Amino acid sequence: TNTLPHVAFYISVNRAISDEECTFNNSWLWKNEKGSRPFCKDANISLIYRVNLERSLQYGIVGSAAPDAKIVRISLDDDSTGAGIHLNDQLGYRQFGASYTTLDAYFREWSTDAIAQDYRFVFNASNNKAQILKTFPVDNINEKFERKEVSGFALGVTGGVEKAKLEARASYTQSRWLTYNTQDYRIERNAKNAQAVSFTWNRQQYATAESLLNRSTDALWVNTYPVDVNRISPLSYASFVPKMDVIYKASATETGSTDFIIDSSVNIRPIYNGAYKHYYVVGAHQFYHGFEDTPRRRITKSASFTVDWDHPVFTGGRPVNLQLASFNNRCIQVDAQGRLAANTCDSQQSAQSFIYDQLGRYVSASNTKLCLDGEALDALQPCNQNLTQRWEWRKGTDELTNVYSGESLGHDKQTGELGLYASSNDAVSLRTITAYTDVFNAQESSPILGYTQGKMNQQRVGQDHRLYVRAGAAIDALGSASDLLVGGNGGSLSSVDLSGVKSITATSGDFQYGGQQLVALTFTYQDGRQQTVGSKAYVTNAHEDRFDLPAAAKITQLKIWSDDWLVKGVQFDLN
Amino acid sequence: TNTLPHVAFYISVNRAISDEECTFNNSWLWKNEKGSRPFCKDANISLIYRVNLERSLQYGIVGSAAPDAKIVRISLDDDSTGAGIHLNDQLGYRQFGASYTTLDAYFREWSTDAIAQDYRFVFNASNNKAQILKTFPVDNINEKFERKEVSGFALGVTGGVEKAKLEARASYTQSRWLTYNTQDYRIERNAKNAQAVSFTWNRQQYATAESLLNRSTDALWVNTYPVDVNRISPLSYASFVPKMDVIYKASATETGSTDFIIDSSVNIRPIYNGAYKHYYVVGAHQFYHGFEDTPRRRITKSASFTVDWDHPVFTGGRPVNLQLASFNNRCIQVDAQGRLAANTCDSQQSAQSFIYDQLGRYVSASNTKLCLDGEALDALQPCNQNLTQRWEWRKGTDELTNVYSGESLGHDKQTGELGLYASSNDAVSLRTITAYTDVFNAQESSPILGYTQGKMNQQRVGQDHRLYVRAGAAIDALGSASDLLVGGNGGSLSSVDLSGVKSITATSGDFQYGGQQLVALTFTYQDGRQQTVGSKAYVTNAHEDRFDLPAAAKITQLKIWSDDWLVKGVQFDLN
Amino acid sequence: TNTLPHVAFYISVNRAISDEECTFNNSWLWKNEKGSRPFCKDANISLIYRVNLERSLQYGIVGSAAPDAKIVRISLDDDSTGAGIHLNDQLGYRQFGASYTTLDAYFREWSTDAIAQDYRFVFNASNNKAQILKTFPVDNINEKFERKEVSGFALGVTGGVEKAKLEARASYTQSRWLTYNTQDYRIERNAKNAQAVSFTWNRQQYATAESLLNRSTDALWVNTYPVDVNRISPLSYASFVPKMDVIYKASATETGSTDFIIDSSVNIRPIYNGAYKHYYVVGAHQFYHGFEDTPRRRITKSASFTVDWDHPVFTGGRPVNLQLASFNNRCIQVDAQGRLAANTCDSQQSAQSFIYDQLGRYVSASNTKLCLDGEALDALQPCNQNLTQRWEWRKGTDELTNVYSGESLGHDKQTGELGLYASSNDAVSLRTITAYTDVFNAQESSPILGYTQGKMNQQRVGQDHRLYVRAGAAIDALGSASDLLVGGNGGSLSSVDLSGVKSITATSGDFQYGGQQLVALTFTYQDGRQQTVGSKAYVTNAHEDRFDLPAAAKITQLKIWSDDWLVKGVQFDLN
């Protein structure tokens, strides 16, 4: 109870990878022909993050070393990593012999499995009320060096007989040595601005295909596969797990709402290595050359969570309730207005939680300035250092009195109305107990459909407890009203009502007609009926995610990632 | 009592290795002739795992740093390793001189003992309710480097006399140095997906037979055995012991059942090194060349354990019972329905265990929401923060009272019926004591017959307390009903009854008539009678495992590893 | 309560960077032609500092190891860094082929992105009452060395036959080896004087463009881009975060005011690398040469905070108040003169705070010599060791008595007038309680408009609760009076009144008509009206900062950075 409260909850990311999404050309000089095939087997992405929410100092403590602030913590370290990210198990390759004319040109192609060029993790903040405080990879590594200077001379004399000869050798020399060390996948932090920080694990050694060669050339006849795999670490292709922390600083006493967006991604690149029939004086030897122009395809996934700066997590002290002991289940519930009511108790009721301070007062978690005073118990007042605000717990008893008069706090038998009385009467009881309660559980995580890019649009759910869709072959705009449709305008409006829908089936991907956006929205009721809007035939690289709710759930507001032309992503802010 | 409970139990793997299973061809170019022989002596596999089951936080504690979760721990580290895995003691070899025509071809063969190519350990989860949280070999090793650049020049002058000469030497030089370190058996973790993680210890240096040569060639007559053994570590062939941890994360409050499958394996590869009669200008010299096309044979074994997410292990607190002290042996036993009965006490009775909380209530391990309240003691209710639910232990006494009224909890002399009374009467007693009891012992481990591969079929035991077999020369399908036979269908159905069978003799192996599957099922009763179904004559590489039970045991359900064509493995879920 | 008080508060710096400010010539030999373009994308600067204020020893403690002093602490370390400073994400470049005559001259230009030449952080003190005590980068790094001396000889004899020859070789050699290590961005502290210390992270290796070459030359035809990026660390261009501490020492018991000025900056330099058509005997080869004459542009930003040496932070003990318990809200408030009054209590009232000492006295935070004595309670006196000055807290009571007589301190019911009485009467009450209060919060930070350079002018706000402006096309002088206008004099005077202005819009930058100074002052009221003075058309590289206040705020004094010719910076000292 004396320690520092925190809030933690695991947030998961899972994303099946289709073999189709891993399909690219079987050659580079011959990309037009030779067809296609999948470049990886059973690719999968599955990481688990750690989330912590804490204030920097206990409530009431003044002038400690740590400045008062609000902290959001996102960590991936030894105690929590997840499963990893996977692309393959082996290293497949095939031969491609010369088909066109062979006079002086490229005539052989060796395509292999794809090694991840770089893993990218990008964080972001919805607005600027958040700040970046600490980053565990404190910054790019500053590498020591070793420079070595060597200067010398040679003085030699030689005498010989055959004929007799005598000569003296005199020489000077100079050389400078430079050396350093380099990580294979070196950390590279990128701080775009004060509200978004991005990490990047990137190749430094053996980065290009050119460095995978163990041979320069051969004779005009040798046919062997020299693209080594012993120089390729299984870290690169088989599996990998990250390690990084980013921690967010917020304003001192700011009240509002904010969204943080975690995006994890992996970049995939096949390797295309060929030989040119260099006909030099030595002969038509096959010097080998890598193809760095080979395309790279980015695969991403997202997750989100909404933090409320008014949440009792940031008060800095474990809250308590007040069970009115005259009844079996009654507690002092306070509205936002200020009045109070005795109702059923709940361990998750923020409007019921309270804080005990150094000055013997009581503070509700609704606002730090909301405090209980005795001159008029009916409602709470903006509080100060009044003597009537201080309360004392008499030892070994259940009578919480005050300091101004010493009279105990008591409540009525039938209505529980609370007042100050010196001694209990027939119709007024004094007993009152309390205990710490969990007001620290996390709100349910709501996954994202589509692609969290572009400016985010925040609009509340409309009058019909649903939204409006302006869609055609491709989605154009979303919103809770006709004018509130952010994005395109070519799609016809549809006023859908969703009060009583079990789930939504949304199919996204590289929409062939246009862009790479979720276009298909199939809504699944409790019975299982389906209503689909969008084009499920003109879609390529389709990825689908399922989004479930309890039936008859009143959605609160919406999140719409979008550019100035179309909707890029959609999120349902649930209860 | 104040510490964090855990559950631990050793799970063992043992597997005799036949010399027949270690038989391969005596040559590679001459594999057809020269017969066969065993490639290892007295091979054996024996490892011991460590199993831990624990929740992340004590029950009732709120908002600590560690998020609430469910953890399954599998470890192989310093404190528990087992015996090891063995393949040989020495390094046998024999000469094979030229037999065919010797003009220009391979003419000598030197076959030796087999060194384990790689040790593979694969874990798996039955369903997706489990997740991968931490892996002790945090990931593939990222190796530092040392790149060194050297550029220099030479300026020299030489004067001589014979005749007089004077010359000046001028030269430039450039060189780049690269170096790194490499483990012999480097760790290589492979994360197939979010529910299964696989480790692999694999050769990096001296991996191929080509690297075992200490000589390039000799004259046209030298006959010596150069395949060195000093470059082969006894780690590789003599003995080995693993070190690795994998730990499983489960959902917050998920209820159900799940199976984890441990598979340990060793891959065996003989080495075939020969010489080609390269007739160059120097002569017919015997350059040596390794044979990497030599087959590798995988040998495996399995073990399993079934965890119950409802087990009192995951409550997070040491349970207690309530011995009704009026009788010598009576405790408050609660059914799944909610009613209670006073019966014989048992230290292993989950339906008898209870939990003491911060709020002075009592929670049964059957469900965290099942709590005892005083308004109607006859059955438990879905509990909340009611005052009538809180109980206090009066100091130095045996009368557990309540807080709502202060009356003690008492029970009747003849039936033990419990009620709330202010003072004990002639027919009602008040004394009640308690103590912590071991409800943490593990369920008996049930080994596996066959090969745990393919999708796993979970079907309950049929009406006759047994299963049905559709078998012929080779097993086709298993199940508890004719329609519930998963796998093939060519075998005739057999309705076997097994209530009162001591043991089952199941002979598996590389079934020559088809596949590598358990086909022979010999059932051994208490007297020792045998009933065999399957082909014991068309089986090769036969491995048998014995499975024992107490007589007259009612098996509960079945586990059937299988592909879409046949049964791959069978498991009996016992009492 | 027993620990050492400190005061902390985050001070932030943010500065948007225009793409225009990052525009320089597209060539160096051809700078006149080929136009211009932006040299960086979305550049941004955002760091967060840590501020601590503490005395070296608890109040009253005598003769400890640590000398009595006053300390101001500014730190950037692991626990607080901010976001970073950014210049780009990639490394853009373009080819520039020969356009003029190509006989013997430079004929190719390769301009690239700009890498920060050096990061500079400069601190300063307004006056000399501050001193520099400790610097965490204790000083420039003193680098170890390794000098190696090698001397040897060669004595060889060779005999041969063709003819027979016999010769003997005799030689001596000498060489000395020198080596050391060098940081890429080596710390370089610069202590200008006793009141200002400046840090500088500067390039040592790969500092000049000449060192970025991976090739000396090529043939007369080769066209390739050799300006490597693998030798350029992403630390240099992508992102960076500092680490440094500077801590300020002040006089023992000096009273006054002082200003510290934090300035963070980044220097930007593009790279211009070309080739000369060196026509030697080998041929017209293109030796490459860097251009170190390329201009560098300094970009800065500032922030400030004003410390008051009389602030209760430097007393060295947590203060307390005295709530007169007869009323609900009354405390003993003391004026600067010495008299007292009972008024409303406030936790931030320095004139209300008090200190408890070893000698049982009470000291007000207004002055360490101001103490309470009992012979005449009406006002405080310069205090000494008098017995009448010592007060004792009777155990378990609320009656603070004295030691001289033992009579308690009491106050009247209606006016609260305090006196010494042995026993309480009807009209005099004795109860008195106290508690620690936060008198440690920081004053609101007031950002700076312009450029904090030159001598700083400190003038109080004039009679009209505003200032006077002497401005024309460019600002000339500022002040609170016609004669108090420090700077130029060509601008006409303007007497602006500002009591009731919400905000001020001030647009600064490289003023084309003259200098680089804020010239445009647009004043924004609560309604939003604008009154602009200055030239918004003759301004280049314009940077604007917005400065907000609550309406009707009485500004106290001014800060005017300026040289002997014009105003360089302006600051409004708020309430």
Side-chain angles (χ1 to χ4, degrees), chain B residues 19-30:
Chain B
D19 284 326
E20 194 287 342
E21 203 148 19
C22 295
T23 300
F24 311 102
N25 306 332
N26 300 337
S27 162
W28 183 254
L29 191 79
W30 300 353

Side-chain angles (χ1 to χ4, degrees), chain A residues 62 148 153 155 157 162 385, chain C residues 170 172 174 179 318 347:
Chain A
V62 65
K148 294 183 331 193
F153 53 71
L155 188 153
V157 65
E162 299 305 317
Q385 292 75 14
Chain C
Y172 274 20
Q174 183 62 255
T179 190
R318 335 182 72 72
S347 290

Side-chain angles (χ1 to χ4, degrees), chain B residues 240-250 252-276 278-280:
Chain B
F240 162 72
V241 64
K243 79 174 310 283
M244 65 182 179
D245 299 333
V246 288
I247 191 167
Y248 273 118
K249 181 266 290 180
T253 289
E254 178 275 336
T255 80
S257 300
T258 312
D259 282 328
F260 314 133
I261 296 89
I262 62 170
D263 298 333
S264 85
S265 69
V266 56
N267 192 0
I268 289 186
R269 159 197 276 282
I271 295 88
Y272 293 71
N273 200 359
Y276 182 76
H278 282 91
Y279 178 69
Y280 193 70

Side-chain angles (χ1 to χ4, degrees), chain A residues 56 61-69 131-135 138-143 145-162 169 177-178 180 187-191 193-195 197 203-204 249 359 373 384-390 403-404, chain C residues 5-10 14 42 44 46 48 50 52 78-83 86 88-89 164 167-175 177-185 205-206 230 233-235 237-241 318 323 325-329 345 347 433 435 438 440:
Chain A
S56 287
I61 301 299
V62 65
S64 176
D68 193 352
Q131 294 291 333
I132 297 169
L133 203 52
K134 182 175 73 175
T135 53
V138 69
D139 186 74
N140 301 294
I141 54 167
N142 214 347
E143 61 278 40
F145 274 66
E146 281 216 340
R147 295 176 64 186
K148 294 183 331 193
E149 281 256 0
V150 163
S151 67
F153 53 71
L155 188 153
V157 65
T158 295
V161 69
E162 299 305 317
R169 266 212 52 190
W177 287 9
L178 191 151
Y180 56 92
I187 288 178
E188 198 255 352
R189 73 171 280 109
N190 202 359
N193 194 314
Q195 64 285 10
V197 65
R203 294 208 147 248
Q204 288 198 1
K249 181 266 289 181
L359 274 166
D373 194 321
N384 48 19
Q385 292 75 14
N386 277 351
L387 182 63
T388 54
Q389 271 201 59
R390 296 178 171 87
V403 192
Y404 182 76
Chain C
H6 324 292
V7 167
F9 60 105
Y10 291 110
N14 302 138
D42 302 327
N44 186 296
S46 285
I48 302 293
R50 171 93 170 277
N52 282 39
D78 46 350
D79 193 28
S80 294
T81 61
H86 173 273
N88 199 302
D89 303 318
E167 61 295 9
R169 266 212 52 190
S171 193
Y172 274 20
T173 187
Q174 183 62 255
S175 54
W177 287 9
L178 191 151
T179 190
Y180 55 92
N181 47 351
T182 178
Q183 299 310 82
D184 210 20
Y185 281 103
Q205 188 75 15
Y206 290 131
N230 283 118
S233 85
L235 165 59
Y237 86 101
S239 305
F240 162 72
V241 63
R318 335 182 72 72
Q323 272 74 350
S326 66
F327 315 86
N328 185 31
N329 190 331
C345 309
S347 290
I433 63 170
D438 172 23
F440 296 78

Side-chain angles (χ1 to χ4, degrees), chain B residues 76-89 91-99 101-102 104-126:
Chain B
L76 283 77
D77 60 355
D78 46 350
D79 194 28
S80 294
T81 61
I85 52 179
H86 173 273
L87 293 171
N88 199 302
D89 303 318
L91 277 296
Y93 84 110
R94 282 82 64 194
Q95 181 64 265
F96 292 84
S99 49
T101 47
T102 72
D104 192 70
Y106 284 10
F107 67 95
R108 197 72 150 271
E109 206 285 323
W110 308 346
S111 175
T112 183
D113 184 0
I115 297 89
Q117 268 288 291
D118 62 358
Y119 308 120
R120 169 171 285 121
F121 303 72
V122 58
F123 302 69
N124 194 350
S126 65

Side-chain angles (χ1 to χ4, degrees), chain B residues 185 187-191 193-250 252-276 278-280 283-336 338 340-368 370-394 396-442 445-451:
Chain B
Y185 281 103
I187 288 178
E188 198 255 352
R189 73 171 280 109
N190 202 359
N193 194 314
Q195 64 285 10
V197 65
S198 67
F199 278 118
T200 287
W201 272 279
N202 172 25
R203 294 208 147 248
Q204 288 198 1
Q205 188 75 15
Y206 290 131
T208 184
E210 181 66 26
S211 62
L212 278 300
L213 294 174
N214 65 0
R215 283 192 281 290
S216 61
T217 183
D218 280 327
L220 279 65
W221 59 269
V222 186
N223 290 318
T224 301
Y225 176 55
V227 175
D228 179 21
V229 302
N230 283 118
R231 278 172 289 171
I232 285 174
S233 86
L235 165 58
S236 65
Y237 86 101
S239 305
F240 162 72
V241 64
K243 79 174 310 283
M244 65 182 179
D245 299 333
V246 288
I247 191 167
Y248 273 118
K249 181 266 290 180
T253 289
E254 178 275 336
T255 80
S257 300
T258 312
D259 282 328
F260 314 133
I261 296 89
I262 62 170
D263 298 333
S264 85
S265 69
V266 56
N267 192 0
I268 289 186
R269 159 197 276 282
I271 295 88
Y272 293 71
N273 200 359
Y276 182 76
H278 282 91
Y279 178 69
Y280 193 70
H285 300 294
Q286 309 85 321
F287 313 150
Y288 297 98
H289 297 289
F291 300 164
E292 81 305 349
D293 304 329
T294 291
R296 58 188 59 243
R297 216 170 173 109
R298 181 148 274 95
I299 302 301
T300 62
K301 201 90 161 63
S302 66
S304 176
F305 57 93
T306 288
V307 298
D308 208 358
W309 308 109
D310 289 330
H311 195 291
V313 58
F314 298 155
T315 66
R318 335 182 71 72
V320 297
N321 290 318
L322 301 103
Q323 272 74 350
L324 278 299
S326 66
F327 315 86
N328 185 31
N329 190 331
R330 291 292 182 187
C331 55
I332 189 66
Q333 187 164 289
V334 55
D335 52 31
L340 53 82
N343 304 117
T344 70
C345 309
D346 176 14
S347 290
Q348 276 77 13
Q349 190 61 254
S350 75
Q352 186 57 71
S353 56
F354 279 97
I355 291 296
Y356 196 35
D357 69 343
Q358 292 83 356
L359 274 166
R361 328 167 299 166
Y362 277 120
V363 182
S364 168
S366 74
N367 170 19
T368 62
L370 265 292
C371 183
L372 169 75
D373 194 321
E375 72 296 24
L377 292 171
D378 63 286
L380 321 183
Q381 288 77 56
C383 75
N384 48 19
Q385 292 75 14
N386 276 351
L387 182 63
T388 54
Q389 271 201 59
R390 296 178 171 87
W391 321 78
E392 183 274 354
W393 268 119
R394 177 178 297 123
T397 54
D398 304 332
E399 286 79 5
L400 181 152
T401 77
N402 64 6
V403 192
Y404 182 76
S405 310
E407 293 180 354
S408 59
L409 165 62
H411 52 286
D412 173 86
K413 313 319 309 303
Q414 66 182 358
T415 60
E417 172 36 30
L418 72 164
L420 268 297
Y421 318 100
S423 87
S424 70
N425 60 61
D426 49 349
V428 161
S429 79
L430 294 187
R431 191 187 285 273
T432 299
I433 63 170
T434 184
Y436 318 96
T437 61
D438 172 23
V439 175
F440 296 78
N441 73 17
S445 87
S446 300
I448 297 89
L449 279 299
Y451 280 86

